[PDB]
């Protein structure tokens, strides 16, 4: 748990599979895996010390669109 | 209006403005006739833009100059540069281009620094 | 009374000698300072990304 | 500056020294003027005026 | 169209005839007004170039950081665009996707440069004097208001010779010299 | 070319002003590069901050000579002119000459009636990298300014305990080979700056065999300079001195050239401060 | 010569004095602050 990199690789296990269908190492990683996983780490580090609304604000989607998305997803 | 043309002459730190307007043929320098431009040895340095091109071209225009700055010899060289540029520039304006060419060939064959600035800009060797 | 400046230091045998021994040590060790006269595979998919971005960059430029 | 000192040997012994004017501006006293005997020149940090009195403390 | 009343506003919540969504804010019309540019297609050509630069910065960003190809290409593209003058500083490398704008390319255009150098009074007069034919860049003169002037040609943009606008400057400052026919 | 030089002055001053405005953004970008590497929480500022986090990919790609010299540090050997004040004296003409011999690639020049703007212009336009103008006091030289030309700094030094080679000893004549340089006890940031000006005034990347070193020893606010020739004996080094010995001392560092007289002032010696004498580089 | 002696002496005397006073102040804060924070830590309880 006090290690810094095994547990990081555990956390972005899923993105790597998703967007490279190995290169877990952060200096051969490429493409949308690189982009999304950087967004991941920054959100975690900022989440421990920022305020809840600004650390995760949601993008703006109109009502019937967002309700439709959540309904399809829950199914 | 009047037909009138202004030119400028320049040696070490002198300056000399010539207004040339069509008139009866007088030449004055700081409000005195040209025949008393002072250092009296170099009066013929001043007369040579007149006597290289004959007097009649100045019989029909009224050239009037003012100088300042510098010393004796520098004001002499500024006056004659301004007069020569004055006469050839008026000739291009208000008579023919051919006579502009003949004037400038006369002054350039004799002494090009009647027309261009003799700038001894330095040299680092 | 006071002064406003330490005055200039008179050059002595001791001062010269200190200076020489500095120089001698730096010249024995030869760590003396000069102005130096300057000079003048990957993976399949990284190679693919490079290729695309180079073609894209050539058209833009 | 004048009549603070009486001879150039005296000024020599005191030169390089601190000095200040009434108005607060500082200076040092630098070289003994030789041709009149008391004076010296001293270089202030701002333009001193004629209505001023330079001083030098000493214990 | 009539400042419609309350019951019908509630029913016609989405109508406007003037400002739609596909007109992105009339951004095009508005920057066109600002720099007095004359072709609809001018704004959208500049946007297609600006779009090229931005997708390229994005693909480079997706390559990994410790990668000398990426480092070389962004350093080289910044120095390209800065020499052209479309972005001002060469340090921050996010300026590719952040501060590269159709408005930046427009303000390197020719009339705006005259206006900035104070050869004009306003961009309408810089355009007007270009179009009447007083401005030159070096030996050859420009009739073309849409000319894009790299920094090193900003050194050379000047008045033409023997224009009446050049004579006015000189006659005012009282330095006409008619041997030049200035 | 006048309009060119002026335009890059205007630009570079601007782009430096930007630099002093983004040192703080430099610092906000360094924090994240620590915290991504070793997992540490971020402050509230960088936490809530989203401009920065949104464009921390590009700036993640981002990452010594002085800046005025960085453009041509190792490429081109300099060209120097060394010139006297105005109506010199016989002793000063000797001093100027042998300074010229001290620096390789220096050309002496006599000033009579060369007004200063014309001297700076003509050097700029001909392309000489820097200019050394020397001031006497009855034979003894007392000042020296050194100024670097494509709009770059001028250091003024005052110079003090002088002895001349030509007037002390005719044991021979100087090597005139690319010398070695020694810069001793220059520590503070201003000290680095003065190292940079003198070092780039010297010549090309000299050989390993050259038996002429030149020492610049900062001892207590006073820069001391000497020339030396040597040999390597089997037990040690035999150093024979040559060239003038004089304590130099810096006392002004303007940013324009030496005509300007209203350029900005990086460092100026202040004598009448309450704690003037206490420190060094003050 | 007397200038060198005077100035060098005076600077040394003032720097040593500064370090002396800082040592007194730092020790007072450290020891007594330990005592006062200990007393207040007790006091909040009872």
Swiss-Prot record, chain C:
It comes from the Eukaryota. It is found in: Nucleus, Nucleolus. Disulfide bonds: none annotated. Component of a heterotrimeric complex containing IMP3, IMP4 and MPP10. Interacts with snoRNA U3. Component of the ribosomal small subunit (SSU) processome composed of at least 40 protein subunits and snoRNA U3. Interacts with the SSU processome subunits EMG1, IMP3, IMP4, KRR1, NOC4/UTP19, NOP1, RPS4A, RPS4B, RPS6A, RPS6B, RPS7A, RPS7B, RPS9A, RPS9B, RPS14A, RPS14B, UTP1-UTP18, UTP20-UTP22 and UTP25. Belongs to the MPP10 family. Involved in nucleolar processing of pre-18S ribosomal RNA. Required for the early cleavages at sites A0, A1 and A2 during 18S ribosomal pre-RNA processing. This is U3 small nucleolar RNA-associated protein MPP10. The lineage of its organism: Eukaryota, Fungi, Dikarya, Ascomycota, Saccharomycotina. The chain holds residues 347 to 445 of 593 of the full protein.
Curated annotation (Swiss-Prot), chain E:
SMART domains: Ribosomal_S4, S4. It holds the Pfam family Ribosomal_S4. It comes from the Eukaryota. Gene3D superfamilies: RNA-binding S4 domain (3.10.290.10). The keyword Nucleus applies. Component of a heterotrimeric complex containing IMP3, IMP4 and MPP10. Interacts with MPP10. Component of the ribosomal small subunit (SSU) processome composed of at least 40 protein subunits and snoRNA U3. Required for the early cleavages at sites A0, A1 and A2 during 18S ribosomal pre-RNA processing. This is U3 small nucleolar ribonucleoprotein protein IMP3. It comes from Saccharomyces cerevisiae (strain ATCC 204508 / S288c).
UniProtKB/Swiss-Prot annotation, chain F:
GO terms for cellular component: 90S preribosome; Mpp10 complex; nucleolus; nucleoplasm; small-subunit processome. Changing residue 193 to A: No effect on RNA binding. Pfam families: Brix. Keywords: Nucleus, Ribonucleoprotein, Ribosome biogenesis, rRNA processing. One of its GO terms (biological process) is maturation of SSU-rRNA. It is found in: Nucleus, Nucleolus. Residues 78-259 form the Brix domain. One of its GO terms (molecular function) is RNA folding chaperone. Component of a heterotrimeric complex containing IMP3, IMP4 and MPP10. Interacts with MPP10. Component of the ribosomal small subunit (SSU) processome composed of at least 40 protein subunits and snoRNA U3. Required for the early cleavages at sites A0, A1 and A2 during 18S ribosomal pre-RNA processing. This is U3 small nucleolar ribonucleoprotein protein IMP4. It comes from Saccharomyces cerevisiae (strain ATCC 204508 / S288c). The lineage of its organism: Eukaryota, Fungi, Dikarya, Ascomycota, Saccharomycotina. The gene is IMP4.
Curated annotation (Swiss-Prot), chain G:
It is found in: Nucleus, Nucleolus. Residues 33-46 have a biased composition (Basic and acidic residues). Residues 28-46 are annotated as: Disordered. Belongs to the NOP14 family. Interacts with snoRNA U3. Interacts with EMG1, MPP10 and NOC4. Component of the ribosomal small subunit (SSU) processome composed of at least 40 protein subunits and snoRNA U3. Involved in nucleolar processing of pre-18S ribosomal RNA. Has a role in the nuclear export of 40S pre-ribosomal subunit to the cytoplasm. This is Nucleolar complex protein 14. The lineage of its organism: Eukaryota, Fungi, Dikarya, Ascomycota, Saccharomycotina. The chain holds residues 761 to 806 of 810 of the full protein.
């Amino acid at each position: 748990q006090n290690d810094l990199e095994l547990q990081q690789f555990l956390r972005e296990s899923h993105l790597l599979s998703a967007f490279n269908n190995i290169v877990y190492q952060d200096d051969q990683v490429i493409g949308k895996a690189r982009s999304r996983t950087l967004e991941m780490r920054l959100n975690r580090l900022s989440r421990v010390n920022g305020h809840q609304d600004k650390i995760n604000k949601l993008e703006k989607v109109p009502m019937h669109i967002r309700r439709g998305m959540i309904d399809k997803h829950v199914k | 209006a009047v037909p009138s043309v202004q030119t400028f002459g320049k040696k070490k730190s002198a300056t000399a403005v010539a207004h040339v307007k069509a008139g009866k043929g007088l030449i004055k320098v700081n409000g005195s006739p040209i025949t008393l431009v002072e250092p009296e040895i170099l009066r013929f340095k001043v007369y040579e833009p007149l006597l290289l091109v004959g007097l009649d071209k100045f019989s029909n225009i009224d050239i009037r100059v003012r100088v300042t700055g510098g010393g004796h010899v520098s004001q002499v060289y500024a006056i004659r540069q301004a007069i020569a540029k004055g006469l050839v520039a008026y000739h291009q304006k208000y008579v023919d281009e051919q006579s502009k060419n003949e004037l400038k060939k006369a002054f350039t064959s004799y002494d090009r620094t009647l027309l261009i600035a003799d700038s001894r800009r330095p040299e680092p060797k | 009374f006071d002064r406003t400046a330490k005055p200039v230091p008179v050059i002595t045998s001791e001062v010269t000698e200190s200076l020489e021994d500095m120089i001698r040590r730096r010249i024995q060790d030869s760590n003396f300072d000069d102005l130096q006269r300057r000079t003048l595979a990957l993976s399949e998919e990284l190679q693919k990304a490079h290729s695309e971005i180079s073609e894209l960059y050539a058209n833009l430029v | 500056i004048k009549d603070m000192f009486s001879s150039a040997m005296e000024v020599a012994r005191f030169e390089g020294a601190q000095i200040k004017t009434v108005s607060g501006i500082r200076g040092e006293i630098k070289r003994a003027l030789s041709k009149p005997e008391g004076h010296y020149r001293a270089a202030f940090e701002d333009k001193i005026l004629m209505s001023d009195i330079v001083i030098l403390r000493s214990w | 169209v009539r400042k419609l009343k309350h019951h019908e506003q509630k029913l016609l919540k989405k109508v406007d005839f003037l400002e739609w969504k596909q007109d992105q804010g009339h951004r095009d019309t508005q920057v066109m007004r600002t720099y007095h540019i004359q072709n609809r297609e001018d704004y959208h050509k500049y946007n297609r170039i600006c779009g090229d630069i931005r997708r390229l910065a994005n693909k480079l960003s997706l390559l990994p950081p410790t990668d000398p190809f990426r480092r070389k290409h962004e350093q080289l593209l910044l120095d390209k665009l800065y020499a052209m003058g479309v972005l001002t500083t060469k340090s921050k490398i996010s300026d590719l996707e952040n501060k590269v704008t159709v408005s930046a390319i427009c303000r390197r255009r020719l009339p705006v440069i005259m206006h900035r150098l104070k050869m004009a009074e306003t961009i309408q007069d810089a355009v007007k004097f270009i179009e009447q034919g007083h401005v030159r860049v070096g030996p050859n003169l420009i009739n073309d208001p849409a000319y894009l002037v790299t920094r090193n040609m900003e050194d050379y943009v000047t008045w033409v010779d023997n224009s009446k606008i050049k004579k006015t400057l000189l006659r005012y400052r009282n330095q006409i010299d008619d041997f030049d026919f200035s | 070319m006048l309009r060119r030089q002026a335009r890059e002055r205007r630009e570079y001053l601007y782009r430096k002003a930007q630099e002093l405005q983004d040192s703080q953004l430099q610092q906000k970008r360094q924090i994240i590069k620590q915290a991504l590497a070793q997992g540490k929480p971020l402050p509230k500022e960088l936490a809530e901050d989203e401009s920065l986090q949104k464009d921390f990919r590009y700036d993640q790609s981002l990452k010594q000579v002085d800046d005025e010299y960085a453009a041509t540090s190792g490429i081109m050997d300099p060209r120097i002119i060394v010139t006297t004040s105005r109506d010199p004296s016989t002793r000063l003409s000797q001093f100027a000459k042998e300074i010229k011999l001290l620096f390789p690639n220096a050309v002496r020049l006599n000033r009579g009636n060369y007004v200063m703007p014309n001297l700076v212009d003509a050097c700029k336009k001909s392309g000489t990298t820097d200019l050394v103008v020397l001031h006497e006091h009855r034979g003894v030289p007392t000042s020296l300014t050194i100024s670097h030309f494509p709009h770059g700094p001028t250091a003024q030094f005052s110079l003090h305990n002088v002895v001349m080679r030509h007037d002390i000893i005719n044991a021979g004549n100087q090597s005139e080979v690319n010398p070695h340089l020694i810069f001793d006890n220059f520590t503070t940031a201003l000290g680095k700056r003065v190292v940079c000006i003198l070092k780039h005034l010297f010549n090309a990347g000299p050989k390993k065999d050259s038996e002429r070193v030149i020492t610049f020893a900062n001892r207590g606010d006073f820069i001391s300079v000497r020339q030396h020739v040597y040999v390597r004996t089997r037990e040690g080094v035999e150093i024979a001195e040559v060239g003038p010995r004089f304590e130099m001392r810096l006392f002004e560092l303007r940013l324009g050239t030496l005509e300007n007289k209203d350029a900005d002032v990086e460092w100026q010696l202040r004598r009448f401060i309450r704690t003037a004498n206490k420190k060094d580089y003050l | 010569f007397e200038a060198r002696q005077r100035i060098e002496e005076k600077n040394k005397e003032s720097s040593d004095y500064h370090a002396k006073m800082a040592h007194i102040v730092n020790t007072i804060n450290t020891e007594e602050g330990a005592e006062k924070n200990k007393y207040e830590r007790e006091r909040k309880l009872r």
